[PDB]
Amino acid sequence: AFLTWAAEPEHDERKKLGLKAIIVISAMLGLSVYIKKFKWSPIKNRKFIYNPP
């Protein structure tokens, strides 16, 4: 365990910062899905009537 710490002394801090990043990035991902769907809905919902000239 001591040698593992010697190889990677940032280990404890790194994993805590990772937890914060995971949470924020996940939330941002979820919101970005809502926002994309919101903005795209006029294109997805578009309907056509064709009367051949």
Partner 1 sequence: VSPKTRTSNLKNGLTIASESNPLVQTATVGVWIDAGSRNENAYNNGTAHFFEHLAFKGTDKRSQHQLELDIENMGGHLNAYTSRESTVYYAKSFKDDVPKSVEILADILQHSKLAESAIDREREVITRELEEVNKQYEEVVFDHLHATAFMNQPLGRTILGPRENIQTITNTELRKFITENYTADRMVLVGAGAVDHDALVELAEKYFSHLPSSQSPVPLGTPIPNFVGSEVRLRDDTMPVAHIAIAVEGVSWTSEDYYTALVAQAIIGNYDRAVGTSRHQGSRLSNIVSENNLANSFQSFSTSYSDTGLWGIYLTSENTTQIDDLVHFTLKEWNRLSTSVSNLQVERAKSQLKAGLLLSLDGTTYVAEDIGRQLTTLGRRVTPAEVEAKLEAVTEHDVRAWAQKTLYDKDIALVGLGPIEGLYDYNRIRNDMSMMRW
Ligand X SMILES: CCCCCCCCCCCCCCCCCCCC(=O)O[C@H](COC(=O)CCCCCCCCCCCCCC)COP(=O)(O)OCCN
Residue of 24, 31, 33, 35 that binds ligand X (CB under 6 A): 24
> Which CB sits closer to ligand X, 17 or 35?
17
DSSP 53: -
**Tally of helices (H runs) and strands (E runs) in the chain:** 2, 0
Separation between Cα atoms, residue 27 and residue 36, nearest integer Å: 14
Residue 44 lies near partner 1 (rule: CB under 8 A): no
Positions in the binding site for ligand X (CB under 6 A) = 17, 20-21, 24-25
Positions in the binding site for partner 1 (CB under 8 A) = 39, 42-43
